[PDB]
Amino acid sequence: GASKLRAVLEKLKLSRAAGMVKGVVDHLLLRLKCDSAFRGVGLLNYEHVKISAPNEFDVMFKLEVPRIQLEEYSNTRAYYFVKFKENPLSQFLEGEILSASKMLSKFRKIIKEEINDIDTDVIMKRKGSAVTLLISEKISVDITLALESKSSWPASTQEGLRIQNWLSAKVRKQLRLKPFYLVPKHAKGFQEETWRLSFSHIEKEILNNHGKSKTCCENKEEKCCRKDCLKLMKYLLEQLKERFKDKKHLDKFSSYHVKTAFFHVCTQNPQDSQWDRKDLGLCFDNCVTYFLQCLRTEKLENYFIPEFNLFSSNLIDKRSKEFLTKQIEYERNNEFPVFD
Amino acid sequence: GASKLRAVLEKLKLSRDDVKGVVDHLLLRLKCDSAFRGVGLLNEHVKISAPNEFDVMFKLEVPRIQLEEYSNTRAYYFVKFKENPLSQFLEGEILSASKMLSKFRKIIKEEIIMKRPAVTLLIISVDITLALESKSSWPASTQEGLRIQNWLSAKVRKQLRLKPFYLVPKHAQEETWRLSFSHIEKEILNNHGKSKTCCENKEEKCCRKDCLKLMKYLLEQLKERFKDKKHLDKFSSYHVKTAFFHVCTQNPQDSQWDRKDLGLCFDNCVTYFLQCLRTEKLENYFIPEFNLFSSNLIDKRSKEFLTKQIEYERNNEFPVFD
Numbered sequence: 001g002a003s004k005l006r007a008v009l010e011k012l013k014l015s016r017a018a019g020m021v022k023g024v025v026d027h028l029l030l031r032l033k034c035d036s037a038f039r040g041v042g043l044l045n046y047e048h049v050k051i052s053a054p055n056e057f058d059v060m061f062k063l064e065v066p067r068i069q070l071e072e073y074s075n076t077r078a079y080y081f082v083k084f085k086e087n088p089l090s091q092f093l094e095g096e097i098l099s100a101s102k103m104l105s106k107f108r109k110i111i112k113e114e115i116n117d118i119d120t121d122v123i124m125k126r127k128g129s130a131v132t133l134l135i136s137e138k139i140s141v142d143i144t145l146a147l148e149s150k151s152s153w154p155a156s157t158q159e160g161l162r163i164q165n166w167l168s169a170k171v172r173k174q175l176r177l178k179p180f181y182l183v184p185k186h187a188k189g190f191q192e193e194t195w196r197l198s199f200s201h202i203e204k205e206i207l208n209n210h211g212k213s214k215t216c217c218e219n220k221e222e223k224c225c226r227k228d229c230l231k232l233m234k235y236l237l238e239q240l241k242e243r244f245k246d247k248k249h250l251d252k253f254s255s256y257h258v259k260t261a262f263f264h265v266c267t268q269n270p271q272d273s274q275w276d277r278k279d280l281g282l283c284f285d286n287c288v289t290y291f292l293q294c295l296r297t298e299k300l301e302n303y304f305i306p307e308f309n310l311f312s313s314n315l316i317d318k319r320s321k322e323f324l325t326k327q328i329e330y331e332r333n334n335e336f337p338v339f340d
Numbered sequence: 341g342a343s344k345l346r347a348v349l350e351k352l353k354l355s356r357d358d359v360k361g362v363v364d365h366l367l368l369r370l371k372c373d374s375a376f377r378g379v380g381l382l383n384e385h386v387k388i389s390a391p392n393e394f395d396v397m398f399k400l401e402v403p404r405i406q407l408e409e410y411s412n413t414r415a416y417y418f419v420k421f422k423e424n425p426l427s428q429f430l431e432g433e434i435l436s437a438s439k440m441l442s443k444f445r446k447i448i449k450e451e452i453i454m455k456r457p458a459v460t461l462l463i464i465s466v467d468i469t470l471a472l473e474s475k476s477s478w479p480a481s482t483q484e485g486l487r488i489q490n491w492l493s494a495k496v497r498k499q500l501r502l503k504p505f506y507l508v509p510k511h512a513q514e515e516t517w518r519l520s521f522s523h524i525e526k527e528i529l530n531n532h533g534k535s536k537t538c539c540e541n542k543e544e545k546c547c548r549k550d551c552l553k554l555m556k557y558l559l560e561q562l563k564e565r566f567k568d569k570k571h572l573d574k575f576s577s578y579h580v581k582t583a584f585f586h587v588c589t590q591n592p593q594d595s596q597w598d599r600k601d602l603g604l605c606f607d608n609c610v611t612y613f614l615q616c617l618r619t620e621k622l623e624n625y626f627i628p629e630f631n632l633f634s635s636n637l638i639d640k641r642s643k644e645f646l647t648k649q650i651e652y653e654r655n656n657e658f659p660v661f662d
């Protein structure tokens with residue numbers, strides 16, 4: 001049944017915009033770099049987090065905080081407090097703690113006064129992880145502020161990134177030498193000054209260099225279907241999320257959940273021969289089945305923070321998971337009509 | 341036979357089972373000079389037989405450089421610039437390796453047993469080499485080189501080319517700098533298979549590294565044997581390493597390097613090296629139009645001598661390995 005899938009992959013392919021986004025983010029950086037607190041700001045990598053939203057872009061603004069002290073908040077292995085006029089963030093302390101609210105409030109207010117200078121009509125949507133702009137009433141851009149630390153990764157990541165049997169232990173050591181990032185994200189009436197660990201840069205490298213063989217998808221003999229499986233998994237969720245848009249059931253589910261499950265499947269199937277392009281229908285069925293397992297199990301560990309469960313009941317209602325399960329199982333049983 | 345090569349590699353590792361942070365003190369006192377403030381390590385032993393001799397590259401970044409090729413020696417270049425800490429060393433618009441080495445050879449003795457690769461410290465021994473670092477894009481002579489696309493992938497080829505390249509003081513004309521990629525060579529060797537997990541599990545154990553070790557040991561032993569003769573004087577472990585890289589391009593798949601076939605793979609490396617001698621062609625792996633085996637560089641009689649000696653060794657189960 002791969003014919004209906006690659007039909008979807010061809011239709012999704014013809015979304016082949018950025019430039020009006022580039023000019024806005026470039027103008028935003030030029031002004032943001034004039035502030036002492038945001039002097040070292042810069043782009044991380046335009047990224048299409050949603051596969052079926054060509055008018056939705058996503059950028060990450062990085063800003064290094066040299067020599068910080070991360071204090072874990074109440075054993076939530078992903079949320080941390082940030083500790084440290086030698087610090088240019090001196091206007092944002094709430095004691096010894098970097099205030100995420102104040103740091104975000106100024107970041108938001110600078111962009112507000114900066115989208116008005118532009119020729120091009122830009123609107124900031126109303127109000128964490130941070131600001132969304134509306135370029136010319138058609139294209140929306142989500143900007144996320146990310147603290148950068150070039151220090152070694154927190155101890156909660158020690159057992160994560162289990163890519164040794166797939167991308168090798170040597171690659172795993174190399175990626176862990178790269179910096180990590182912290183995004184302002186409240187934690188569960190919420191601790192409003194916490195930051196969540198972020199490895200979006202590592203996730204990019206893993207996706208765009210994804211085979212056991214270094215030449216995977218570089219010749220016809222080693223062409224795998226890893227990327228297509230993730231694309232279809234994202235399209236499925238987006239279609240269902242939009243189909244049941246005003247039932248609120250699928251609100252808390254996002255492409256990161258689907259992307260996390262896909263990484264775990266990559267660990268369980270480390271050989272390129274398990275992802276042969278002629279097996280797209282089977283491979284996709286196994287990806288859908290595994291995601292369904294995480295739903296029924298209420299266990300989807302963060303790929304980098306294994307003790308952080310993305311599908312715990314404290315984060316996502318069991319009813320919402322049961323609803324996602326029923327919808328996905330109906331689709332898979334009936335050859336995915338939501339793709340049409 | 342094949343058991344003789346495994347025995348040699350076995351003795352080579354006992355030879356290295358049992359090193360000096362002296363160099364860390366050198367860069368302490370060397371970084372305090374104005375012209376050498378951007379100094380540091382780059383990463384080794386060329387002589388695999390005697391591990392009592394080390395080799396270091398002292399990297400020094402040279403920001404605004406424009407390279408001009410010297411009479412189409414696609415490896416050698418004059419370094420000019422486009423406040424300047426090395427203003428002491430200019431001989432006009434070009435940068436003098438003579439005065440830089442002299443000042444570099446002045447503080448090695450000042451802040452010190454030096455020996456006038458620029459210097460040699462006797463502790464053990466370490467060959468210190470001065471290298472200019474350039475973060476610019478590689479010269480046009482490297483365009484058709486690093487042919488690793490069918491082996492380590494085109495993607496990897498693009499990542500390594502973004503890394504800086506280096507220039508060492510090398511005679512050709514006496515103020516020329518030769519291209520150096522000892523850092524890329526290091527990565528290519530310590531990350532050598534088509535599979536990223538090559539040599540990380542018994543199922544994917546290749547013999548690439550051992551074929552290079554035996555090739556280096558074969559040349560070093562023959563060079564010692566005929567030391568009183570001058571035939572093998574200009575052959576070096578870098579020639580052996582370069583030939584091994586081209587053999588890797590020729591045999592990209594890991595299945596062509598199964599450690600069960602050490603004898604077959606090693607004979608492949610010998611055969612190709614032999615072919616480079618008879619035809620007098622051994623291109624630099626990064627600079628293809630630079631032939632390390634040209635008749636201008638090495639005597640044909642010298643090549644034919646090494647050819648006949650290695651041919652004797654291969655025909656008698658390599659008694660050089662006893």
Ligand SMILES: O=C(O)c1ccc2c3c(ccc(C(=O)O)c13)C(=O)NC2=O
Pocket residue numbers: 078129196197198199200252253254255256257302310
């Ligand atoms: O789509 C999102 O909101 C989202 C984006 C990125 C990330 C996450 C994470 C957890 C939950 C969500 C979410 O709330 O869905 C999410 C996470 O642990 N690491 C991320 O990098």
Ligand SMILES: O=C(O)c1ccc2c3c(ccc(C(=O)O)c13)C(=O)NC2=O
Pocket residue numbers: 415518519520521522574575576577578579624632
């Ligand atoms: O062993 C050496 O002398 C040596 C070391 C390193 C290099 C070279 C090169 C050419 C010739 C020799 C040599 O003359 O043998 C050599 C070269 O093109 N690139 C090198 O990186």
Ligand SMILES: [Zn+2]
Pocket residue numbers: 210211216217222223224225226
């Ligand atoms: Zn692939």
Ligand SMILES: [Zn+2]
Pocket residue numbers: 532533538539544545546547548
């Ligand atoms: Zn190997």
